[PDB]
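Human:
Class, as today's exercise, you are to examine the entry below, and be ready to discuss the fold:
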Amino acid sequence: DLQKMVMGNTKPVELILDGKTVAICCATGVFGTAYLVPRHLFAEQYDKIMLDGRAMTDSDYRVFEFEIKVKGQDMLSDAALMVLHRGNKVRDITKHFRDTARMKKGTPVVGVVNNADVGRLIFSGEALTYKDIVVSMDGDTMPGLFAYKAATRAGYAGGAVLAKDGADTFIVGTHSAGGNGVGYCSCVSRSMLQKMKAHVE
């Protein structure tokens, strides 16, 4: 049921630069008109942002960035929050996130995707462990992650990853990167979202 709720909140995103689609990804609605989106993408050259078929510009929303502490050093999370000033409301699923959730290595993981490339899709995999950071050969850093074995592709970023903790099923965060049969999602805590939800009111 949670998976269904999440798929219901997942929208396709197409970043356009001069009539050209320079990138695609997913946007996971978490409440009102707030959607978790890939930060590394919402920081490039765009003239139009297509959200579920709706053409927008940077003036139709606000992007909040989460700052997490990794071993005492404050780092920027790849999971950012795009809040549309106006639009159709999405279901509130913030209570499905966690703060002190534990994932048993090897347990079922589910990635929820919805983009212009593969359409509505689900990818399953097995939990590995948490990872403080995953730097790119270029210097880009993604902190507070959770690794898992799975077949992921570019454009999956933004989709939510679900895991299990005993009889509990919850949202770990949003897919950020992957390859070599292994993927990573940026962890998003329940508190992070609650405080952020209260801020936007």
User: Anything to note?
Assistant: The CA atoms of residues 66 and 77 lie 6 Å apart. Residues 190-200 form the longest helix (11 residues). Helices lie at 2-9, 190-200. The domain at 1-92 is CATH 2.40.10.10 (Thrombin, subunit H).
